[PDB]
Amino acid sequence: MKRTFQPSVLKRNRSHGFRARMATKNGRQVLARRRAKGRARLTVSK
Amino acid sequence: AVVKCKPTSPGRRHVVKVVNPELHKGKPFAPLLEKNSKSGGRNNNGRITTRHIGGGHKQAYRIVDFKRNKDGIPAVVERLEYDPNRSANIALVLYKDGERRYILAPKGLKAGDQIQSGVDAAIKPGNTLPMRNIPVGSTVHNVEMKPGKGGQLARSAGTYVQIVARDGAYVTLRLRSGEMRKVEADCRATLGEVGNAEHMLRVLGKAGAARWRGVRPTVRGTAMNPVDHPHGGGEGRNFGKHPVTPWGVQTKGKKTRSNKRTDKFIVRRRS
RNA sequence: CGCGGGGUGGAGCAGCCUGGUAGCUCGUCGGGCUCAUAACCCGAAGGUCGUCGGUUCAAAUCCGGCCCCCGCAACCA
RNA sequence: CUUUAAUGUUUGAUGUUCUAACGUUGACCCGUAAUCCGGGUUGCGGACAGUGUCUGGUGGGUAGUUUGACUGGGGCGGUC
RNA sequence: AAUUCCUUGUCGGGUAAGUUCCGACCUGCACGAAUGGCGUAAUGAUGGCCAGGCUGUCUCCACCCGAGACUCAGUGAAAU
RNA sequence: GCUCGCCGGAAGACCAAGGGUUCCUGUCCAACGUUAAUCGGGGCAGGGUGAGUCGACCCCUAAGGCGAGGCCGAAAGGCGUAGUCGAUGGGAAACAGGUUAAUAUUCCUGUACUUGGUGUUACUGCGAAGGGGGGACGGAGAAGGCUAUGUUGGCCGGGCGACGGUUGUCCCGGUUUAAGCGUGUAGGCUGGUUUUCCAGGCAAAUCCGGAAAAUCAAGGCUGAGGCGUGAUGACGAGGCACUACGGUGCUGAAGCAACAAAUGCCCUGCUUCCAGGAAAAGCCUCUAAGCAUCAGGUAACAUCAAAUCGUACCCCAAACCGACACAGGUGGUCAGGUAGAGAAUACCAAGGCGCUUGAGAGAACUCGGGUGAAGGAACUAGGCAAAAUGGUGCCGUAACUUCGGGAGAAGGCACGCUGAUAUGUAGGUGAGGUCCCUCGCGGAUGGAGCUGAAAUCAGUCGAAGAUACCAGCUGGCUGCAACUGUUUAUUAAAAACACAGCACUGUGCAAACACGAAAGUGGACGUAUACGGUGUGACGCCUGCCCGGUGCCGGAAGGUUAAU
RNA sequence: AGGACCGAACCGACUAAUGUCGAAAAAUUAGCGGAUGACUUGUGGCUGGGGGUGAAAGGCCAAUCAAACCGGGAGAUAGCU
RNA sequence: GCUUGAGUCUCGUAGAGGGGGGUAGAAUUCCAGGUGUAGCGGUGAAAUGCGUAGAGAUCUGGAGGAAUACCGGUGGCGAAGGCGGCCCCCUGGACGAAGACUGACGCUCAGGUGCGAAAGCGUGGGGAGCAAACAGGAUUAGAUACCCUGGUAGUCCACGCC
Predict the structure, then answer these.
(1) Closest Cα to residue B105, out of B130, B129, B81?
(2) Does domain A1-46 bear CATH number 3.40.50.2300?
(3) Which CATH fold topology does B195-271 show?
(4) Can you give the distance from the CA of residue B13 to the C1' of nucleotide F501 in angstroms?
(5) Whole-angstrom Cα distance, residue B166 to residue B150?
(6) Which fold has domain B1-113?
(7) CA of B26 and C1' of G12: distance in angstroms?
(8) Which nucleotide is nearest to B76 (CA to C1')?
């Protein structure tokens, strides 16, 4: 069958990357939330 | 001419193609082009603002002139081209001074005749001259609204406008739909009936004939689900309701003339 | 089992709804007109307003019983 | 009191004209090599149109809810 | 009749035998002319019926060849 | 290691995507592998990724994102100009051979090419966010010329052979060579050059476009392959030579011709048809504001620079995605021999594998199949499943029809091998020789060699010659839908939806309608032969009566009627 | 020329059996339909929860759809178990 | 061979002959405005219909499509059907005149081809009046007829068919 995951680093970083969430206000508090919980993997990054 | 192809496949058995022999069978002028990509009827918010739009062939745009701001300069036509961004034929006419400009190809015009643009011109097919200098009652097209906009009246195949009155600063026309309206008399209006007049005889034949021209298949309202269309439902084709548009207003008779900043100029509605 | 409407000269409908006065077409009897029939023209008779009781000056009328008729009733697993 | 006539005065409903509000997804110039836009000339409309506030109508396009119970199961009929 | 309740309606044809099917009679519970009516060449992984051909589908299964099932040695679940 | 078997348009060999050392070596077996395990994609340790020419970065754009000001919006924030980002696109330049346990168009050898900087010499006018050309393009179809590659032969090397023959028309192996430079062909496109003038290209212009004259008829642009050169170099079968017995050192013959032939190249061609087929930069060129003993540009030569990153391995899978070492899914390129129309298929070459539980037994029963007496749908909801039909050429072929079909209708005949016609034909290709010449990759002519259908006749073999794999079941009546197509991914693929066609109705452009508090957009840079809604659904013959109820349109006199 | 015919790659999923704690949370095997077109496919984007998309099934929107998921209202409420 | 058959050439005549393209005037209808007011229209009579929201009547302006009053005549032309306001372009036949020339080149004609009122049909326009079907009002025993008020196709144009 066709499993729901066709990885693509650029596509993964174009709309889920660091700057993409650092792009606007709402995404900014996403990191405010994850920084509050303190995830080592702050965002899906390199 | 007006020909029908012989039947090979059920779809070719109803194909009437409009073959014009005098069409330019080569590639067109370069400097007068620009990419005219489509967006499938979607806007800034990308939603389908207008239905039945999407797909189709990838084609380019030719900046065809309507304005005709060139004055008192003779110009000889050179090539007849059927443009993919119209319904009527355009003609490559070279303005003697050194520039080629695309204009709508009229009925009485051979790609090799000399047209002249200006008020000094007589009454011959293809010339741009004011209506006040024209014996009212003639047959013209590409009539302007603003004295310098270009012409937004009768710009399709086999189309024209009958000139009714010329009372002073106003020129009352009888549009193609029959709408009697006055316009500023100093405007420009080109003579002659628009060519490519056998366009209405063009039957498409197969389903694809309308598909590659962009028009998407229309899904009827009785086909929809009660949640989708205001109609929908009906177990076994039960309509029983007054026909409406997918958003409320009762169609098949509901005039939408709500302008008022320009309602005044009309003399007769289409009645 | 129920609900709604009607019951008016030989045929069928008005009038009822909103109480004092009962009409129309065909038909019946008959004449004339035609040689004859029908048709036509014209006049008259013909209605206990299904039935009984109640109420008010007067009951076809307003109401309550009995009888007759038309439609729907003989489902959902 | 009624019918009525000239005038003063007081507001209103229409018709036409005008230009200054306003509109201008008309032309041209400049900012500016920039189809956005702003300003400047000019033309075409014109106290319209359009927008705010109040208001009548319409309105399942949209939203919140109601849609009884008894019943020899429920529904139907009936009843309270 | 994708519609006909009554009904397997009536008659004819197909079969030795036809609640299906084909052609007709109209008694249309309750077809009907763009929620289109009636025909229709071509087309169809479409519904129904029939014939030829061909065969294990069946009368009635019989044998054989491989993979499991059975035994042995190693590993070793599961619903409950 | 020797046999056996499997794929062989793949289960082979290289990449992108994506993973992340799974690559190579040594060592170890508790834990991982559905078994054992000295084995391994498992543990520990060490090693490996070398670039001016590959890709990216870079230059420049597309869909689209963001967006100085600006418009707008309770706020957040939304759209959008100038700009700036963003490939799946375009834009400079390298190939062959050898080598490692693992990498190499990157290292080495040999032989080339590209873009800039600086300096020198000799000439010469150069110069933009501006203009022009170019870049720059569609589907399909047919033809010609070649190549990749393959076959045969010649030649060279070796053998002449464990059971009959085999020095001969015998057998086997090899017979390979790029980028670049020069030549500029087969073929395609286009008439050149000179003079003058010009409301044209937001300004200018010698560049382009246009209008008249002149002279001559070719010039120019482009272009696969061949041929020389690259290269008396490399590689090269097989010997010669030492073994840690894995492999290394050395040497080295032939290295051509002919035929057939790609979906590859010429071709970003040519013909034709319609649904009418990116943008910008690099590049070439003209001038503006200007700068001229300059600065710069052109040409030759010398020298220098080409930085940063990726480079291992897997890449139709035990390394990606699916929880797994999962019978599933994953884009592109290369792609031989024989038979065959073919990339189908069958058997093989190259190369890679036997699927990480096996050994016995041969019951019932279950699954995948083979065969079957007589009958042949009697089975069953139903011919479901099986069986059968199945290829080429030729003969022949109905009702009906929109005159295209129906149709490969149905139904039949010949199919192998050998010789002959003919020491292998028609056809295809084509050297030498000869002649000519505006002498070159030339034109006629000439015919060796090579290759090679099909048809007729005769003979013979078997039961059967499309002998395998492969490969339609057919006809008749009829309902519905026109047809191709689409849909309930994961129980419904149809009569449902769509469909071209038709009709009604709304719409005069700042159009209706729609998304959006607004601005702004789509519609459409379209404008009534146009765009939107609805209904039906080819074509043919037609589409009757009803305006009472509801909705809608028009008309407003009167009654009534909110705020004020 | 053909929404042309036959038929591989490719895409789809009509029938039958196997399978159903499977090899697989819809596949395999043997036959099938389309296969120059309304075709298929890679890469990169845009449209989003009462909204998007829809050759219209109330299908699809990350194994979840007559209104996705995640967190917060919220220990919602439950005459019921 | 010849010419009385037939055909051709020179100069003229009349004509709704045909096709294509312009144009004019009267009338009818509609629309807009001004004046003005209870009928208008219709028939054997009446009614439907139109009208006090102001018709009809009347004046002015504008837009239309179709047919061409008088001239018009048992007049003309053409094979027949058929064809008439005027003007232009292209064009067919017939007839008269005085001669020449070719020298039987002729008559008809199954099959075949072409043309062919109206009605009807297909495609795309147009659409005043008129008017199948149809509706209503009357007549009538019945009237899906005759009469009257409205009225779709069609009638008109370009290309084909019958």
Answers:
(1) B81
(2) no
(3) Ribosomal protein L2; domain 3 (4.10.950)
(4) 13
(5) 20
(6) OB fold (Dihydrolipoamide Acetyltransferase, E2P) (2.40.50)
(7) 41
(8) F210
